[PDB]
Design a protein around this ligand. Structure first.
Ligand SMILES: NC(=O)c1ccc[n+]([C@@H]2O[C@H](COP(=O)([O-])OP(=O)(O)OC[C@H]3O[C@@H](n4cnc5c(N)ncnc54)[C@H](OP(=O)(O)O)[C@@H]3O)[C@@H](O)[C@H]2O)c1
Ligand SMILES: O=C(O)Cc1ccccc1
Length: 314
């Protein structure tokens, strides 16, 4: 039900994602989620809805439905705030929008640093993304002091390949190990090598886009759909469960934290009923065989960035 992190904290294996969740629908979505039983919410400054997520959290706290210690709130540092002096300020902005005094987990959203400014994806006259000269090690040291100041209880990373994780682990004077590495994971991108590597170093893996993210903006009619895969429908039918429920239970049995997104009350409730059944070892091996190495989030505009994470095998 909860996984143990290297800072001694317990992280709910199931959480609610908020990317693409409209500001006018997410407050109600988070409220319903908390009522249903969710104790983990995944957020990010770049989602432009943290203020609205925060309204939900504050309402449930005032209502006594949950106490702060029961909730596990996660947010992420955007690429335009990688410089030393900007990290504390970005965390503080997120804390105010969410209306909390500490975050349970703060992740470096992407290993790529962009030029600071108002634009999330700063461009030049040619049209490509302008990088920052900062590196992963300097940004990590800034994340470490947020723990020393009490702003966050744990720090982690997101979309980091194995070599980038190595860099941090082998950094001189390392004070806090990354507690979590949140990566894209589902049956079409199983990530067996990155997962095995992270797990061997005591780093918890969080799987994002577990349903294949059918609502991504760059969606094409010829792209593969997990929710409609006949082979996955068969396994679901065999268990008297929905395909989404199977796609959510899949990573849990691999000892991964899963964070499916939804703004629909019935779906939010449906996605929660995944603790009452088990996928057989055969079901797990079969699902793993469906890997096509297909990524939903490839950050294609940063293919030339010095820190792009997807050139390495894992
Ligand atoms: N760290 C990173 O770089 C990063 C990147 C991507 C995502 N994430 C996190 O991962 C979270 C989840 O990934 P995601 O948002 O890309 O997509 P996802 O959870 O894989 O899929 C969300 C989509 O599936 C639909 N859905 C949810 N439950 C369903 C069900 N039971 N039956 C049918 N359809 C269902 C949702 O529709 P409705 O909402 O309409 O119900 C929505 O369209 C994000 O919100 C975010 O918090 C992190
Ligand atoms: O990185 C993410 O979580 C998804 C995302 C893609 C493009 C713009 C904002 C967020």
């Amino acid at each position: 039900s909860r996984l143990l992190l290297n800072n001694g904290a317990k992280m709910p294996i199931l959480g609610l994602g908020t990317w693409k969740s409209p500001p006018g629908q997410v407050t109600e979505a988070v409220k319903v989620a908390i009522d249903v039983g969710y104790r983990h919410i995944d957020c990010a400054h770049v989602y432009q809805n943290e203020n609205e997520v925060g309204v939900a959290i504050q309402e449930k706290l005032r209502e006594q439905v949950v106490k702060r210690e029961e909730l596990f709130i996660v947010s992420k540092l955007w690429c335009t705030y990688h410089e030393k002096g900007l990290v504390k300020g970005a965390c503080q902005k997120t804390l105010s929008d969410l209306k909390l005094d500490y975050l349970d987990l703060y992740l470096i959203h992407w290993p790529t640093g962009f030029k600071p400014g108002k634009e999330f994806f700063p461009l030049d006259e040619s049209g490509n993304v302008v990088p920052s000269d900062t590196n992963i090690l300097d940004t990590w040291a800034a994340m470490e002091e947020l723990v020393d100041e009490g702003l966050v209880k744990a720090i982690g990373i997101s979309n980091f390949n194995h070599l980038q994780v190595e860099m941090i682990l082998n950094k001189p004077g390392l004070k806090y190990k990354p507690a979590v590495n949140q990566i894209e994971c589902h049956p079409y991108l199983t990530q067996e090598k990155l997962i095995q590597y992270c797990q061997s170093k005591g780093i918890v893996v969080t799987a994002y886009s577990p349903l294949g993210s059918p609502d991504r903006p760059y969606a094409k009619p010829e792209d593969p759909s997990l929710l409609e895969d006949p082979r996955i429908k068969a396994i679901a039918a065999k268990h008297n469960k929905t395909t989404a429920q199977v796609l959510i239970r899949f990573p849990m049995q691999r000892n991964l934290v899963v964070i499916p997104k939804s703004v629909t009350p019935e779906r939010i409730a449906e996605n929660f009923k995944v603790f009452d059944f088990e996928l057989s070892s055969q079901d797990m091996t079969t699902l793993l065989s469906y890997n096509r190495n297909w990524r939903v989030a490839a950050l294609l505009s940063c293919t030339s960035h010095k820190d792009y994470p997807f050139h390495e095998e894992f």
